[PDB]
Design a protein around this ligand. Structure first.
Ligand SMILES: O=C([O-])c1ccc[nH]1
Ligand SMILES: O=C([O-])c1ccc[nH]1
Ligand SMILES: O=C([O-])c1ccc[nH]1
Ligand SMILES: O=C([O-])c1ccc[nH]1
Lengths: 335, 335, 335, 335
């Protein structure tokens, strides 16, 4: 044996889309706020990140999060998100994960009915309530950012062969792009979606050319990751079926929280029911998140809502990672 | 927490291509020989296999092996190989892994100069010597089956667009199919090889139509997995660069032992040097196995050799897997 | 870090009395029968045993075992028993411990009413039935080796303090000497643990040499390795309570299954309590086992009683032991 | 299995005297200073402490701590100290243990010559320098809180056996009473451990109430929690050797860093050995620390000596503790 570095992680997964929750192995992250804690994980580390997210440990579509100290006084703990493509600001599919594992293990004391836990993340402080049935977690509701519709219609080039036929854009903590499948020859099944991953990611690059828009107020994103394909379900519980291409060139096995916390803008104002409804929203894997509007914050420009999205995480093993200072691929090797 | 089942694995990787080595969690596997031990893992289990190899735990190109009891008296232990596509009979990339981890941990006493360990596997008893430098393993030489060339030239249909231009076939513990890249528009880099994985796997199905051949003596394989693309290296240490498409629809991140233990038939008889030479043979990842002929067993039909292939495995964390009897994806979920 | 060997274990406890269960730390261990499996420990290793049982890992007292392969038909797995002082032939609280974990971790599939496990002492094949209440284990009934009275009364020696006279000695999977707490004048409280330990192993020694001591079968035995003190109870739920001094000078925190299976074996032959009757045997700590007499049987000399004893184990953490080949105390300390 | 909470730990030992280091079992623990971090343990939890230190997990003796966040500038991380009896302010062998592991596991990056770690007692910020020899740690120099003589001579009481007279008492990060082994008539061998433990905590109690006992700073202290027996050595490499009775009635297997940092503090003021001079202080077990006097300093009453002590820790396995919410002894047993 050998090892140099040894990192303690809990494997989760939430409706597919895995989440590696680093619990021990880095005891303190200097930063005052979780935003600069993150910056201090960027540089300095970001190779714990690569070691864990890239092969031979991780894989293309792999994800995870570090539980750290709070510094913020409200209670609980701090988290930072991370994936094959760097560090994400907020990642529902993972706020679920973190919350589930925090209660399931002793890291927070479980209430019994529903445990409220508020984690820090480099984004705004995040609010999850954990439905627990006497013994165990059943599912988690995470309340998302004020999300909104951006500019209805719009469409660019698209190669082979149509030319043709319009799309849409909206927020959800991050931007997105909406396609009704008909755009061409997609089917969104385990069987293929090799054409989907490639014809989806190429748009992320194509737009980024223009129709650039910073969210009115604050200044980070500028433009585009986080596209989306949708059309008609296969789980009868649901409505629609869709998936999301993002970060380096991955697909989401989960319906995508930040996804559903977007385009739920269309549910109001664009017709389709109005407020405090059901929405049950499922991915390629054939597993479903529940989305609901809640408050409906108009705000001066546009019209917005503060959504509540419910998913469920299950622990998939406990990990003692160790990095061979001889292993040529000791950190992240990719494809 | 919960859990029902809990399985102890050591994560390895050998020149990419990961290997999950299940050490504890199933104490006895009934079978007299490792072949029926394997059969008894097939049925009965083969969902430890799916849980570990499929998502959210494993991934498309994931691999591993169970260390079990010997029953055979020679010494050491028994192993069974397994991957996303069932159970492989022999898997160099993994005989390396197993041997490396067996010595690196206390499971076999390390010699110091080079530890000889002979593992069982459901295939023939396998022979690895482990170069160890005072403290640690450096690399492992695994001596392979009598391998051979099968029928020079040959070619079938191939769609889009050439029609055109010939291939070849040979053994290596398992069959294979050899393509000189020129066949069309391949480049064999991390950048793409989406066209390579798809245009490679489609041949595995296309042939299987005819030119069927059982290895003369014994009766298992009949026909085809385990194709191969090759042409000119990028690591100057090497010669050629190539990769292998196999099992369900994966690529090998390793050069492929069973690969190199084949087509080293061409090195003799077909020209190219003769016997007890160097061959250094590298994959897409840009990492290299060393292959050498050794004995050269003619055998009545055809001409064969008993090769020695050297690779190196590094431990990439220790795993305590646990399966949620609520988790809908408690066993293997795929794409 | 550099570690040389690494052993994977499960921390159990059964009515106190910890049990370290080694799972897949070493892959195969040869000896045909579990007796010569034990010899193939002992003569080799027995410094896994010291490393684990002695400080700084274990402590004086501290107990545990290894799950291995069977070789023997019908048995689900092997099992050996080990402690600070060496190796015991059979351990009630240990067999409870093994069976509980075997079901609890899913090493064997759980029947739901009562899960029937056969382990391989070595003393002899033992049948444990694991009461599981839909979800989890409730208690384990272990039916022990044919137990018997040996010698009747028997005579003693003087050192500390004064001569004194009668006692008795008996088999119960391991051999025993039973004292009323009058003969020596203690009373079985934590207050006096130390005088019991010291005068306990002083008798264990100075009845040995000396006495005839043999089991008509086995023909490895001829050693009374445990001394048993008893007196009337404290908890009214229980009858007469004991503590057992053995291996180097350690007490049992459990009532000692092999101990009680020996006591109620002297009874029945002694008169008192006459088959299928309740026995509730308590330790020092306050923890109780439930014994009952079953199928009588004889052994090639004298009529025996083939008892059953019921206790309850709990898992108390999972352990990845590693030994630094620099650490001066890499193996068993002592004190 | 169902477990409620799960704590991740690293088993260490430093010249005997085990240390259980809790790493990322609980994510954030609030108290501004490490003193009120300790209070926020103690008052809350302190049954993680019992679960870990008491049987069946720990034992009488047995020691450990929690790595936490800093809050305090310049310090690499937090650290608290805990044992069977409660919480200590500062632990030499424990600070050795923490620093060794912190470097060994890569929790902090290793400098190569001498790796400088600042931990947060709470007693006060301590500086440890980890001698690492290219590959691995060789030894840790921990420079301790300003230590001093307190009271000079001082008077005693009679119970078991007879009155007797003089001794002395001193600070060394924790408060102490030092006895020549004449006053009480022992000799520090394993033979008599038990009489030392029992008469040790009997003095620890019956000097307390009674005496003045206070550190001019801190103003949480006013408790002499450790009694120190000393007499001339056995190993000629060492000078006078000791053992320390504390927390509930446990001995130290190490020479006790906080103990020696208190002894050579009475010395220098006593005459004898006059700064930057060798001190080799041995325990009972046979293990030795190296103490030396440094930068003098005073404390708001009396002149102090600010000592350094050097020992060596080794990792003795990694621990995933889990507590069954059924297990009657889920938390600390006792005996
Ligand atoms: O739904 C989300 O929050 C998310 C982030 C990245 C992929 N999905
Ligand atoms: O090289 C090998 O042995 C192998 C088996 C499957 C993929 N590679
Ligand atoms: O419970 C038992 O069988 C046992 C043996 C030694 C200590 N306890
Ligand atoms: O080494 C020490 O500092 C210590 C404190 C208690 C036991 N040992």
């Amino acid at each position: 044996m050998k090892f140099s570095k040894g990192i303690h992680a809990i494997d989760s997964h939430t409706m597919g889309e895995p989440t590696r929750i680093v619990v021990g192995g880095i005891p303190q992250i200097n930063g005052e706020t979780m935003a600069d804690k993150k910056k201090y994980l960027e540089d300095n580390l970001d190779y714990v990140r690569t070691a864990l997210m890239h092969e031979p440990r991780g894989h293309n579509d792999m994800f995870g999060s570090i539980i750290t100290s709070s510094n913020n006084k409200e209670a609980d703990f701090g988290i930072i998100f991370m994936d094959g493509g760097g560090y994400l600001n907020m990642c529902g599919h993972g706020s679920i994960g973190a919350a589930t594992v925090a209660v399931e293990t002793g890291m927070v004391e479980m209430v019994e009915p529903v445990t409220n836990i508020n984690m820090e993340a480099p984004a705004g402080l995040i609010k999850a309530k954990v439905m627990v049935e006497n013994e165990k977690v059943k599912e988690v509701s995470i309340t998302n950012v004020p999300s909104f519709l951006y500019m209805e219609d719009a469409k660019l080039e698209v190669p082979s062969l149509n030319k043709t036929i319009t799309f849409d854009i909206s927020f959800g903590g991050s931007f997105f792009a909406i396609i009704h499948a008909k755009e061409l020859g997609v089917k969104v099944e385990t069987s293929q979606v090799d054409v989907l991953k490639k014809l989806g990611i190429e748009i992320r690059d194509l737009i980024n050319e223009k129709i650039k828009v910073q969210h009115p107020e604050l200044e980070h994103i500028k433009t585009v990751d986080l596209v989306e394909i949708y059309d008609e379900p296969s789980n009868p519980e649901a409505t629609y079926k869709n998936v999301v291409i993002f970060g380096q060139g991955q697909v989401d096995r989960s319906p995508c929280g930040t996804g559903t916390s977007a385009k739920l803008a269309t549910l109001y104002k664009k017709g389709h029911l109005k407020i405090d409804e059901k929405f049950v929203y499922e991915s390629i894997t054939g597993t479903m998140f529940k989305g609901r509007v809640l408050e409906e914050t108009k705000v001066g420009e546009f019209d917005a809502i503060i959504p509540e999205i419910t998913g469920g995480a299950y622990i998939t093993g406990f990990n003692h990672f160790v990095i061979d200072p001889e292993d040529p691929l000791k950190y992240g090797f990719t494809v």
